[PDB]
Design a binder for this molecule. Structure first.
Ligand code: COH
Ligand code: COH
Ligand SMILES: *[C@@H]1O[C@H](CO)[C@@H](O[C@@H]2O[C@H](CO)[C@@H](O[C@H]3O[C@H](CO)[C@@H](O)[C@H](O)[C@@H]3O)[C@H](O)[C@H]2NC(C)=O)[C@H](O)[C@H]1NC(C)=O
Ligand SMILES: *[C@@H]1O[C@H](CO)[C@@H](O[C@@H]2O[C@H](CO)[C@@H](O)[C@H](O)[C@H]2NC(C)=O)[C@H](O)[C@H]1NC(C)=O
Ligand SMILES: *[C@@H]1O[C@H](CO)[C@@H](O[C@H]2O[C@H](CO)[C@@H](O)[C@H](O)[C@H]2NC(C)=O)[C@H](O)[C@H]1NC(C)=O
Ligand SMILES: *[C@H]1O[C@@H](CO)[C@@H](O[C@@H]2O[C@H](CO)[C@@H](O)[C@H](O)[C@H]2NC(C)=O)[C@H](O)[C@H]1NC(C)=O
Ligand code: EPA
Ligand code: EPA
Ligand code: BOG
Ligand code: BOG
Ligand code: NAG
Ligand code: NAG
Lengths: 551, 551
């Protein structure tokens, strides 16, 4: 078998076979040397002693409110701390990207082929005597058994951080622009070739699709008016391929950027809100530039909405998730004197960790109705019956579920969760503890340390035997959450760097793009730097209802 | 007409219309302010006073040969100066890229669509009152007239720098991996979607082509043996599409990565050499790694060859062109504490400036034969009859033509030269003086200043009227050359920054790739770091004939 199967190389060292029975570690720039890259250079030893742990930094960020009150109001300071926040997680993502499901060593195929998700860790080699390499049993536990014992919801566990259905659908709408698994090819492949925040879920992945969705007048997107309300256009009008069951009324077959968005009225809510936002920005730009044509109006509005999206994700969405007293800031200037690559490639592991199905409730509570999954699926008439305004008001009040902490996956989505386990295995994912080390975290020494609990720990112990072979995806959902948090440490420490890269890596954040002229003048630039989840709903939903990501 | 037609914004300020008759300049980070970004800030004024001109720097580097002989032998000094060489031309290229032929403003379409060549300067607006903006006559001079008066060769003018045919064909071979104009779509479009040194001209642009070219044993490429010599395989053998006129017999239809390389035996010479090098490197890696499979062997050989190419290009090719006494160095590490983007997008203008057709001789001299263009083109029998050893020996001896200095384009390729002017025009290229200011050069105040001569300048005066509407392409070919040099100032100053980006911007130059493990260990790494044009020929050509890019 492959001599690297045991993952001997530590601290980001790279393993390479040298003959059938031998390996060498390459410790270049790791800060370590020795056969396994385990011996610290002097400078490294100092850095390691002085560096605070993620749990310590989180404590400091979620306490001392008096300090953060001052910091948040001194702009020079707020910028300085945000600069630390951004740069601390910069050495952690390979960029240019490296590995993929088919390549456990660097290759031009892995670099150049955009159809693959990239990989933060190389796959376990094909011939390893064990699923995770060398430790554990010959077979991993039955995935159904893992799912049922420690993943499936018994009683609904509410998010102690107070996440609402506005947050849950925002998460799903946002991520589905860049997690677009090409199931025809396999779980290691994506259809989102832009690899980030390009708003293809609004505009379409291809030029053919975009041009079918565009009005070609005033930069705008096609729409229909139903009962005085602006909604996305139909499949029939646009000839735009969408996923719908045969039994759906023509006018409820909405055509939008992402093909799967008719699946959920909650997703259509955001599709409609964003469509309106685009057309609203078109109106503003036309007033500012009566000289501009349709093409420049469209393209400029698109860049602005990309900007809006990133502003909201950092300052409202990530801000909410973080639980910090410090106010995070979207400001591209902060990296201008740093070393940062303005590029991104979506990691398979980012896709995996983002399977936050425990967010979903048992019923979808709108006005006085309580919709089950069956009746809520594919049913856009619910959106039109209640209206966007009542959707917002209802979803702002309904609490979402806790993600970490175990046993909170709705049984309606049990097949998706089993698939996450099975697909992790198909893609030869390394173990939880390997991923923890990869992201500078101490490996868990027991199952009880993982869960911070006794019952699920015992069930996991009997299923896996060894903590070093525990799988990543189920570990994220059973992990001991931070104090009164939705997530555990592993979710945040893996998730933050992928996120930073996807948000700040966008070309509009680069020195040559981050200029008022890029966005049609100071008015366009202003739209971005004033955007909030509240302003988005206020400007596009009748009656400007109050909204937020928390109940 | 477009308010920005006059190109009012200076010092890299961005122009934007505000109403039908008004414009506004964006001076962000230019170091300038004022309506047209012309009045400098204090630090800028100090920065301009202390900055030497390109001609001063060029003089220094090509004189004091005794001082440079010292500096070349102190590793620390050599590294310091090479670092200065690289960084001084870094702020000059938009990365991530901006404009293209269809977009004079920044857009997601221009950023994301790899089928376009990018643009260092935005195109002149469709409705401008004058071809170049507002200056000059309603029409540019007839291209046929420009070609015949100042571009076409009467006597052959040899390169005073001594460039040989090994150099001419290396240039043609190398650049034709990234200059692959999509003639179906137009001159603004490329088929080189890797946008740089990916070696698709050896391995093929698509995985289909690669797979038809590969042996699938020992990492190797397919080949044939003729008279004990290793040559590329045939179209019939591989089923790989090549461009060959119908009269070319089955056995002389060699299949290589780039479909046009059958055009010239000089190109087939390099294709064969590089094919041999790949299989040579496969042999080495197999010895170091008896345990590797075909796939890892192929991929690792590819990364090694990419490295070899970059090394040879910098230390032999660019070294020769420069005429510097300073020994240039290929060392990715020099950029590790610098702000640099590991990405590239091929610029339309890089393509245009690289139309070095004056390099081509009147006649191709192999052994005691003197082949005309008609005889040389599409004729691989010439290669098989003489052999690679004789090709190398002959091409090493035969001098190339001077590029700058006017009147040196061979009549045989006149249609090609006329197409360069014509296509610059339909792609709406801005003027030479605009391109000079974009690259921090003083605009030419007269045609006599451009040529450094009276006769051609007078001809150009009659054709263009105004120096500020003089076209870029013909200017490069008629420009006053540096003392005893092949090129003038515009060629070097525009060319060099594009080159840096294509070479150092390659993923293998990034810190996560630049390690021995990427290349199969210390042996593979040493192949990259000791590569040269002489070693390339020595390793792969019978008898190891001496070679270089001069004499
Ligand atoms: C962010 C939170 C979130 C939510 C609230 C959510 C809500 C729901 C929901 C009820 C409203 C249903 C019926 C589904 C149904 C599915 N989801 Co999600 N999903 C979520 C995060 C994800 C992500 C991320 C993926 C991976 C996308 C991919 O790989 O294409 C995913 C994958 C899936 C898949 C398998 C791949 C696919 O077909 O796209 C199904 C089926 N699911 N999901
Ligand atoms: C680098 C120097 C160099 C050399 C030595 C060279 C030598 C030769 C040569 C004899 C060996 C022949 C028969 C040709 C013939 C051609 N060359 Co070149 N070319 C060179 C640089 C280029 C470049 C660069 C292009 C653009 C290619 C593209 O964009 O596909 C080009 C374009 C062409 C075209 C396309 C015409 C057009 O529409 O632009 C033809 C035909 N020519 N060339
Ligand atoms: C990115 O990676 C993809 C996976 O390697 C790759 O798709 C694969 O493409 C090859 C060749 O085009 C297909 O293999 C073919 O082999 C023969 C043809 O001689 C046929 O018998 C097969 O049916 C098939 O056409 C693979 O099927 C295909 N693999 C998939 C879809 O998973 C992409 O081509 C790569 N992308 C780019 C742009 O290079
Ligand atoms: C990149 O841009 C080009 C130029 O527009 C696109 O090519 C056009 O595609 C449309 C829609 O499929 C065709 O109708 C046109 O004929 C094409 N124009 C041409 C050939 O010049 C191309 O599709 C774009 N690439 C991507 C990935 O969207
Ligand atoms: C900025 O540039 C513009 C255009 O180059 C200048 O506009 C004018 O320049 C001359 C000075 O007034 C006028 O005689 C011209 O009519 C007009 N130019 C054109 C093409 O219409 C303007 O002066 C400049 N502004 C500053 C502050 O220097
Ligand atoms: C770093 O590499 C590992 C390889 O996994 C280690 O080798 C093994 O360590 C085990 C536990 O100590 C031994 O039981 C096992 O026999 C051993 N295998 C060997 C020596 O071939 C190396 O000891 C270690 N090297 C260094 C220098 O620390
Ligand atoms: C700019 C973002 C980078 C760092 C922000 C600091 C801390 C992150 C805090 C909480 C985030 C929680 C979990 C991370 C996982 C997914 C969220 C990423 C959001 C996204 O970009 O899709
Ligand atoms: C994808 C493109 C990437 C790399 C191209 C590499 C080399 C192209 C070579 C020269 C570019 C054109 C003109 C420059 C001429 C002489 C260079 C000498 C001055 C110098 O750069 O040090
Ligand atoms: C509703 C989700 C559970 C479906 C059947 C339970 C699968 C067996 O799982 C068991 O569940 C019990 C109840 O939570 C626990 O006490 C056990 O620790 C667990 O192993
Ligand atoms: C021999 C040097 C010629 C001097 C340059 C100006 C004359 C070029 O003129 C052109 O020459 C071409 C060559 O075949 C012909 O095809 C054209 O008919 C002719 O107009
Ligand atoms: C769809 O929604 C309507 C209310 O808008 C509801 O009454 C109906 O039962 C739903 N239909 C299905 C098929 O569940
Ligand atoms: C091709 O080259 C051969 C020499 O090998 C020469 O005799 C012949 O004339 C050439 N073919 C043509 C048609 O030009």
């Amino acid at each position: 078998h492959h001599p690297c199967c045991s993952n001997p190389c530590q601290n980001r060292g790279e393993c390479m076979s040298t003959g059938f029975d031998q390996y060498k570690c390459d410790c270049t720039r790791t800060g370590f040397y020795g056969e396994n890259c385990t011996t610290p250079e002097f400078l490294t030893r100092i850095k390691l002693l002085l560096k605070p742990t993620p749990n310590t930094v989180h404590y400091i960020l979620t306490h001392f409110k008096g300090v953060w009150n001052i910091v948040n109001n001194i702009p020079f300071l707020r910028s300085l701390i945000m600069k630390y926040v951004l740069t601390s997680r910069s050495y952690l993502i390979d960029s240019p990207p490296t590995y993929n499901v088919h390549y456990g060593y660097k290759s031009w195929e892995a670099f150049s082929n955009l159809s693959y998700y990239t990989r933060a860790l190389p796959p376990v080699a094909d011939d390893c005597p064990t699923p995770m390499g060398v430790k554990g049993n010959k077979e991993l536990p039955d995935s159904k058994e893992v799912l049922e014992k420690v993943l499936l919801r018994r009683e609904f566990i509410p998010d102690p951080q107070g996440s609402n259905m506005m947050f849950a659908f925002f998460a799903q709408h946002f991520t589905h622009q860049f997690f677009k698994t090409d199931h025809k090819r396999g779980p290691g492949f994506t259809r989102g070739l832009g690899h980030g925040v390009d708003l293809n879920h609004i505009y379409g992945e291809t030029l053919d699709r975009q041009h079918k969705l565009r009005l070609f007048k005033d930069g705008k997107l096609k729409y229909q008016v139903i009962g005085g309300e602006v909604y996305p256009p139909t499949v029939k009008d646009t000839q735009v391929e969408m996923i719908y069951p045969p039994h759906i009324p023509e006018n409820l077959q909405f055509a939008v950027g992402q093909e799967v968005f008719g699946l959920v009225p909650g997703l259509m809510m955001y599709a409609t809100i964003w469509l309106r936002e685009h057309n609203r920005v078109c109106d503003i730009l036309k007033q500012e530039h009566p000289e501009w044509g349709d093409e420049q109006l469209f393209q400029t509005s698109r860049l602005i909405l990309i900007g809006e999206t990133i502003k909201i994700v950092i300052e409202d969405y990530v801000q909410h998730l973080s639980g910090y007293h410090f106010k995070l800031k979207f400001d591209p200037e902060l990296l201008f004197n740093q070393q940062f690559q303005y590029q991104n490639r979506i990691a398979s592991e980012f896709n995996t960790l983002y399977h936050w199905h425990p967010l979903l409730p048992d019923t979808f509570n709108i006005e006085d109705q309580e919709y089950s999954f069956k009746q809520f699926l594919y049913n856009n008439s619910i959106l039109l019956e209640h209206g966007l305004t009542q959707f917002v008001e209802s979803f702002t009040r309904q609490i979402a579920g806790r993600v970490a902490g175990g046993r909170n996956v709705p049984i309606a989505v049990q097949a998706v969760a089993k698939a996450s386990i099975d697909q992790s295995r198909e893609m030869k994912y390394q173990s939880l503890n390997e991923y923890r080390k990869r992201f500078s975290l101490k490996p868990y020494t027991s199952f009880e340390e993982l869960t911070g609990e006794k019952e699920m720990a015992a069930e996991l112990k009997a299923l896996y035997s060894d903590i070093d072979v525990m799988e990543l995806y189920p570990a994220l959902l059973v992990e001991k959450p931070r104090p009164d948090a939705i997530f555990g440490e592993t979710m945040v420490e893996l998730g933050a760097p992928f996120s930073l890269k996807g948000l700040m890596g966008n070309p509009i954040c680069s020195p040559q793009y981050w200029k008022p002229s890029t966005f049609g003048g100071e008015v366009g630039f202003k739209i971005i730097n004033t955007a909030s989840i509240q302003s988005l709903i206020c400007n596009n939903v009748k009656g400007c209802p109050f909204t937020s990501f928390n109940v």
